[PDB]
Design a protein around this nucleic acid. Sequence first.
RNA 1: GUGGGAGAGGGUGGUGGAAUUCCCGGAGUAGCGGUGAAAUGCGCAGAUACCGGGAGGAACGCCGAUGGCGAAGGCAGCCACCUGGUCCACCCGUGACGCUGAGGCGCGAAAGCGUGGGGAGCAAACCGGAUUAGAUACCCGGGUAGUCCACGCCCUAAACGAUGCGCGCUAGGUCUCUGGGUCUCCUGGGGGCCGAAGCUAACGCGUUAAGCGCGCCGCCUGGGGAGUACGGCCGCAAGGC
Lengths: 155, 73, 119
Amino acid sequence: ARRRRAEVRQLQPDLVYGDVLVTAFINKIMRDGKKNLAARIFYDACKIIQEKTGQEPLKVFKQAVENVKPRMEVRSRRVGGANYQVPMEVSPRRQQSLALRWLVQAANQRPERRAAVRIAHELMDAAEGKGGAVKKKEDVERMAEANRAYAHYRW
Amino acid sequence: PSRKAKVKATLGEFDLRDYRNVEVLKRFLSETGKILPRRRTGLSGKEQRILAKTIKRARILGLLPFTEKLVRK
Amino acid sequence: KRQVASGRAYIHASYNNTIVTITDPDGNPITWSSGGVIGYKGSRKGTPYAAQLAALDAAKKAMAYGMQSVDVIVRGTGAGREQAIRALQASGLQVKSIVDDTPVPHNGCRPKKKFRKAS
RNA sequence: GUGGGAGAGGGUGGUGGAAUUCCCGGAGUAGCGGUGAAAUGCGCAGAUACCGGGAGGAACGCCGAUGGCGAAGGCAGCCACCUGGUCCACCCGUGACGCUGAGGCGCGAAAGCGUGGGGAGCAAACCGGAUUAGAUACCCGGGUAGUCCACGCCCUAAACGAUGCGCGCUAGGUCUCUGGGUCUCCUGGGGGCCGAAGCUAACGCGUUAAGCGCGCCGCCUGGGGAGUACGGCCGCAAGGC
Ligand SMILES: [Mg+2]
Ligand SMILES: [Mg+2]
Ligand SMILES: [Mg+2]
Ligand SMILES: [Mg+2]
Ligand SMILES: [Mg+2]
Ligand SMILES: [Mg+2]
Ligand SMILES: [Mg+2]
Ligand SMILES: [Mg+2]
Ligand SMILES: [Mg+2]
Ligand SMILES: [Mg+2]
Ligand SMILES: [Mg+2]
Ligand SMILES: [Mg+2]
Ligand SMILES: [Mg+2]
Ligand SMILES: [Mg+2]
Ligand SMILES: [Mg+2]
Ligand SMILES: [Mg+2]
Ligand SMILES: [Mg+2]
Ligand SMILES: [Mg+2]
Ligand SMILES: [Mg+2]
Ligand SMILES: [Mg+2]
Ligand SMILES: [Mg+2]
Ligand SMILES: [Mg+2]
Ligand SMILES: [Mg+2]
Ligand SMILES: [Mg+2]
């Protein structure tokens, strides 16, 4: 993107919830372009956050993402052969991208054999405030801070 | 920029050679005891050149400072 | 231990580290701090953060002696120096005033090669 | 000659404040310093940072310039004395007394040399730390000669405007320093830039000529060997011509 600032490709709302965030999350799950099995997995996951939670899945989902979002991250920047870990703010766009990506990531590291379980349980522990996804989020924010010293390389 | 005013126009006539006239003299130093440049003293090559020796005289006599502390920052 | 209330905060900025020295009303040091005093060991004592941490360490340590306001006196030109100032401003201690007093010769000793070639 | 003028022009004595270092006192504590990172190093025998006093050497911030002075080298904190050059006005005095200048004599930055003194900071050599393939370097910590004064010597240089000195002649514009005048400008001396004619291989130069001319000196004659060898003169030497 050297010419002009790329377009935030607009996504179509969720058929079942009418949400664009859900689709996004669905897309991160999808692999080899199998949106069906992708969409499926997600929904079964919502149904599981039911048989186990008296709260609406979408409620869970939303809150899960909100917790896995990093507000500070490290980005490299050379300055004399040695490139320092410069801590800077994370834009909402990436803040969201990173969260969803991390959710599906952590979720798939889980032991439960079934896909939707792994995703529901991750979404669940997500809103809870625990789980591998939220972990990465925290290890990251720890990286910043641990580098406040170099904060003066804002840009 | 020096859009302020000229130390010369900001007062009347005076004996530039008078090294004891602390009043008018101190009027030619900066916040710091430094000798103001012509862009600001509004003097002339020749005039400004005498101010120089006058101020320096008063300084040794202990009437004008060689330096001041920058208040603020 | 000897409650001094008001005093002097000296910031000694530089390209290699910052160091603040709180003193009583007439130059005598109550407490001091620096980029080294804190955790930073080398290249970052100069860092502006280090300046902040140090200035704040000076604050606390100085506040214990029951101090609550000082005049700041900055010396030197260095990375993180205004941060020390901002620090002390937020340190709790009331920053009564600020004054740069960095020394400059009227041309005395031949500078080291590192600082020569000037005009 | 008379009357005026500007100047870091030179010599001698004195003197001021800023900073560094060291020492003394106070207060204070764990590092400071240094770097791309670091380390050598310094610090609990108390450093760094901070306040007070003292000692000493060297340099002279702002003013400061496009500035000024000098034949060049070069010259700026302030005061005094001693001394050089120079510009303008008046048109007063002498009456071609002029120009140039082989050799001569004098001056001549830095480094270097001799005797004595001085020595704060800086720093060839050197002692170390780091970098690197190595690092007899560049960076970092130290450090002697020296850098400072006196007296004597050396005489070199990109000692440059890479442009010898003097005189007369050939559009102007604009900025500037210093003087005189009838002073929104005229006239004189100096510093810059642009540009008439003209010059130039070109770049450029152009009333501060590299233009147009006269006078005198110096110097060049393809590159390397070579600023060497030899000889001579000079120097304590290094070396110089
Ligand atoms: Mg792109
Ligand atoms: Mg006559
Ligand atoms: Mg006659
Ligand atoms: Mg002659
Ligand atoms: Mg000589
Ligand atoms: Mg010498
Ligand atoms: Mg000698
Ligand atoms: Mg000697
Ligand atoms: Mg040294
Ligand atoms: Mg070495
Ligand atoms: Mg060295
Ligand atoms: Mg000649
Ligand atoms: Mg002109
Ligand atoms: Mg006039
Ligand atoms: Mg002229
Ligand atoms: Mg003129
Ligand atoms: Mg022509
Ligand atoms: Mg010709
Ligand atoms: Mg051509
Ligand atoms: Mg021209
Ligand atoms: Mg030949
Ligand atoms: Mg031949
Ligand atoms: Mg030779
Ligand atoms: Mg001989």
